[PDB]
């Protein structure tokens, strides 16, 4: 059931990275987008955000979201999560780091809830193009028409087709830890943490400790506060500094792997044939740019393939050998002459 995914649900931690277009400039958003994979057909997009969707801190849920503000995971009800493109999208499902959504064509993808007092959105430059499966360069999945073996991402989550790495988080910096006691700098730890003390003054440079204080140095701006939180693990993101140790294992299954489904494809209007002596006058009234392919059935193929968008009449020389033409997604047909 839903709770049979403890590897990603329990162990993972919402990390924060460097969104390129966080609102006005590049801030450090908790929803730093990574690995946009718009490689499907019908226009479904898989986005690997830096936030962890679905699971409340308290084991598991789905109506909740876990994002990291500060040193703590301030989890909330997911409520107004936007997934934007040239036009706003409509999300399908969300599972931990990944969120599957269906978008219209565009050149930018932006993600963001709006926690209410603050927005915390993020975008990234990445073109998204949607080629419908078939011979007709349509734009949106139509109400009716024939069906073809498309490829897309399943809405299902309980799959293990592919895995991704997840190791110990790196040494996250936090300047807010370098407080002072009016005589010397005081370090602090919230709970179970093991911070690192470093300062510019000639002193103990290593400073690995729980709650403690500097030896001699006094200038806050002349020190470093590195934080260690190895209790949880994070995704191997390219915008986060590597931990100096071992690549901790644990294969997080990819929630939405591609599958070979069946999408509804458009159906071009039927051509109006008009026979002529050894000549096939073909009246065409396309609705959207559709491929037209014809080939002679004789010894010489004599291929002809050309996209047609504006309604036009084309003619072909149908010899006694015969001719074949495939208009749109219609099944191929054949013809004679006298």
């Amino acid at each position, epitope marked *: 059931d839903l709770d049979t995914h403890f590897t990603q649900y329990k162990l993972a931690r919402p990390y924060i990275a460097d969104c390129p277009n966080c609102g006005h400039s590049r801030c450090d958003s908790p929803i730093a987008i990574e690995e946009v994979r718009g490689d499907a057909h019908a226009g479904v997009i898989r986005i690997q955000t830096s936030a962890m969707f679905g699971l409340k801190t308290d084991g598991v849920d789905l109506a909740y979201m876990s994002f990291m503000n500060g040193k703590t995971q301030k989890s909330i009800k997911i409520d107004n999560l936007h997934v934007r493109t040239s036009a706003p999208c409509s999300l399908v499902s969300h599972h931990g780091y990944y969120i599957l959504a269906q978008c219209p064509p565009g050149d930018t993808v932006t993600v963001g809830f709006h926690d209410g007092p603050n927005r915390h959105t993020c975008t990234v430059a990445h073109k998204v193009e949607f080629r419908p499966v078939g011979r007709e360069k349509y734009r949106h999945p139509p109400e009716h028409g024939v069906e073809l073996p498309c490829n897309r991402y399943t809405h299902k989550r309980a799959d293990q087709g592919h895995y991704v790495e997840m190791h*110990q988080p790196g040494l996250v910096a936090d300047h807010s830890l370098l407080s002072i006691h009016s005589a010397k700098v005081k370090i602090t730890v919230p709970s179970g943490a093991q911070v690192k003390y470093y300062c510019k003054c000639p002193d103990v440079r*290593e400073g*690995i400790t*729980s709650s*403690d204080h500097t*030896t001699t140095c006094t200038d806050v701006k002349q020190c470093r506060a590195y934080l*260690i939180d*190895n209790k949880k693990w994070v995704y191997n993101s390219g915008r986060l500094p590597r931990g100096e140790g071992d690549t901790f294992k644990g294969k997080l299954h990819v929630p939405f792997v591609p599958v070979k489904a069946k999408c509804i494809a458009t159906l071009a209007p039927e051509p109006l044939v008009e026979h002529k002596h050894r000549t096939l006058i073909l009246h065409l009234h396309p609705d959207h740019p559709t491929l037209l392919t014809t080939r002679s059935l004789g010894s010489d193929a004599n291929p002809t393939r050309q996209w047609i968008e504006r309604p036009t009449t084309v003619n072909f020389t149908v010899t006694g050998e015969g001719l074949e033409y495939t208009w749109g997604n219609h099944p191929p047909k054949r013809v004679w002459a006298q």
Partner: antibody
Amino acid sequence: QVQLVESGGGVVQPGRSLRLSCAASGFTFSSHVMYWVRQAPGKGLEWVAVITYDGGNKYYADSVRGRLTISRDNSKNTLYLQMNSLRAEDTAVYYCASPRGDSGSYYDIDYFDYWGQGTLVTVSS
Amino acid sequence: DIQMTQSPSAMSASVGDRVTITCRASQGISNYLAWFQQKPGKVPKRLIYAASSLQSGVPSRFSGSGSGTEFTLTISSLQPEDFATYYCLQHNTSPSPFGQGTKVEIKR
């Protein structure tokens, strides 16, 4: 059974160098933090140095910093202490030790459970 | 650096006595501290860790208390095998200094 066996102790002249070794067995040596502790004749214990499972970090008491170098060879299950510029004050039994046999990258809270019998270093002319 | 101060440096006690050894850190070490017994000519043996976790296989007569800067080893009823030198160790930071050691001798 977990064993640690120190070797390479002996008599050395002041200003000379000596290399201690500690062979390990009965546990996964390459996964655990290793420590040197010394005890001068008739004195209390003195913490000398520590090295991580991978050797990537190394720490030293200020009394030995710049003169002693801790190292390891995980392929040989062997810990080393290179001692340079030895002084009469470095005359001690040197003990090889580890925490309880459970692992970590740059973390430990089981300091000093398993130890060797120690090797005597005498620094004298 | 951190320094560990033990009090007393030596004490005389009888079999059955309650022995209390105090260790003070020069800076806060939370509870990342341990206690070690050494008999003459032997290797040290750990008795307590985390300032109160009794080591597996060590007698229930040993107990530990304190946090932050002030810590203690309490032997509730001193046995003949307990006459030894006792060290505190802080393990919150590296370097990890031992205390000077407290020698428990037989009172006569």
